[PDB]
Amino acid sequence: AAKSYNIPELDKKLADRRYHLSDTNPEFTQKILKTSRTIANMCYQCGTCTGSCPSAPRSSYRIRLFMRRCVLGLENEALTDPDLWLCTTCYSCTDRCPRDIAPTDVIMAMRNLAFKRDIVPKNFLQTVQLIYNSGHGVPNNDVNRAARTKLGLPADPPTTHSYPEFVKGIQKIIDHYELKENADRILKG
């Protein structure tokens, strides 16, 4: 941690672990507050949120550390953390926090910011593809068409699948947020 050496293995092994005041950008923290709609800066690190988490006992995911990073404005540390997509959004932390914080909403805002930096698991992009094409993240197939026919049901449910005219409208919504273009250009090989 003496200085940069330009030897990547040594730069990784001797990374500076000290928090500096240049490591904080407020802009990150008020984007988080203006997107999550929660009083995130009011956390005083009681640890109830982590003690509630079903993901914490089996991984390195710690929601309290993410709250601390949000308070200290440590972008490039929260966003580029693979344990950001282990939150199931079970809302147990939000249900138990003594400060009326919704840490899972902070997680959602962080995930939004991470998507705006091309950091995103590929399942989300595939779901975007599916919803853009058909309006359904979990679409219908021939075998269930046969099953529904055997149930006395119509082959296609009363959805955008039966009525494709609505699908175009859905597409416009995605097209308004440039979401299709980003999903396409990130799904590239």
Binding site: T89, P121, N123, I131, G137, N144, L153
Partner: protein, 296 residues
């Protein structure tokens, strides 16, 4: 005689149609009229879609809401995740002015607007409530006693949590869904940490599947130790995770679980004389035959 638009999201019509059919028919024989929405789409799934962009989540859920709005009816639901999306966005846009304005100016591109005139209910909400069909009316509508079956209830997460955003009471030892199973004549059993997430939420079930299965296997260990003959759900996400996950836990790990898991509406159908055939039990990854032989 109360009538509701039936939102009918992705998994129930597209992998477990028996849940759809049982919902319509069972709600019909009790005093409720579930009738289709006009071209409803995926409610923007709160995990798999709300993680990458919240504004598209708002816009799509609002479009789903305003379909029923122009339909002049309020929505009934059978999915906890669909409940999260639809009900939460409806609650948010009725109070936040600037978010509603942004949603409306996005929706203006398809000539269709949000104003917030309807309400959203889970079909379990209606099945309990007293003005709508109560628990006694369901108990009366039961033809086959369906007794002699240890049933474990899984509440899920998006229906009741958080307390500060919901209205269902205590999210830490609820008993109401237990009363719903009890009305059918099946005895509900208690198992440790019964309020635990199934692990499929937030897109985790897609992102790192082994982590999600470990959360499901903990739940399944507890449920078997209780001695359950079946698991009951109010969420097709939880349905999918428990059934297919049992298939993938048998594969990935070496844990054998043959516990059938059913949405509550298949149990209502079985209690009300519906056959396994028109409930499409064969589309479940885990065979329901032991449970049916126990109850019939």
């Amino acid at each position: 005689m109360h009538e509701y638009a039936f939102f009918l999201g992705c998994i129930a019509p597209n992998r477990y149609p028996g849940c759809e059919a049982s919902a319509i028919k069972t709600s019909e024989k009790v005093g409720i009229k579930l009738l289709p929405l006009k071209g409803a789409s995926c409610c923007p799934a709160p995990g798999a879609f709300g993680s990458i962009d919240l504004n598209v989540w708002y816009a799509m859920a609002a479009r789903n809401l305003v379909l029923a709005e122009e339909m002049k009816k309020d929505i009934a639901l059978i999915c906890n995740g669909c409940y999260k999306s639809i009900w939460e966005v409806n609650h948010i846009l009725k109070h936040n002015d600037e978010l509603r304005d942004n949603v409306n100016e996005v929706l203006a591109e398809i000539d269709m607007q949000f104003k917030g005139t309807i309400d959203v209910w889970h079909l379990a909400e209606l099945y309990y409530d007293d003005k709508v069909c109560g628990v006694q009316k369901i108990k009366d509508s039961v033809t086959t006693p369906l007794s002699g079956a240890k049933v474990a209830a899984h509440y899920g997460c998006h229906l009741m949590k958080p307390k500060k955003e919901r209205h269902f009471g205590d999210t830490e030892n609820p008993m109401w869904f237990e009363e719903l199973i009890g009305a059918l004549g099946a005895e509900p059993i208690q198992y440790r940490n019964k309020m635990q997430c199934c692990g499929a939420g937030g897109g985790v079930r897609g992102y790192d599947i082994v982590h999600a299965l470990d959360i499901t296997n903990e739940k399944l260990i507890n449920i078997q130790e209780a001695g359950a003959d079946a698991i009951t759900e109010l969420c097709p996400f939880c349905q999918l995770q428990f059934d297919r996950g049992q298939i993938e836990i048998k594969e990935k790990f070496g844990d054998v679980y043959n516990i059938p898991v059913l949405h509550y509406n298949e149990l209502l159908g079985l209690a009300q004389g519906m056959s396994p055939q028109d409930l499409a039990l064969d589309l479940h990854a885990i065979d329901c035959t032991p449970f049916l032989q126990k109850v019939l």
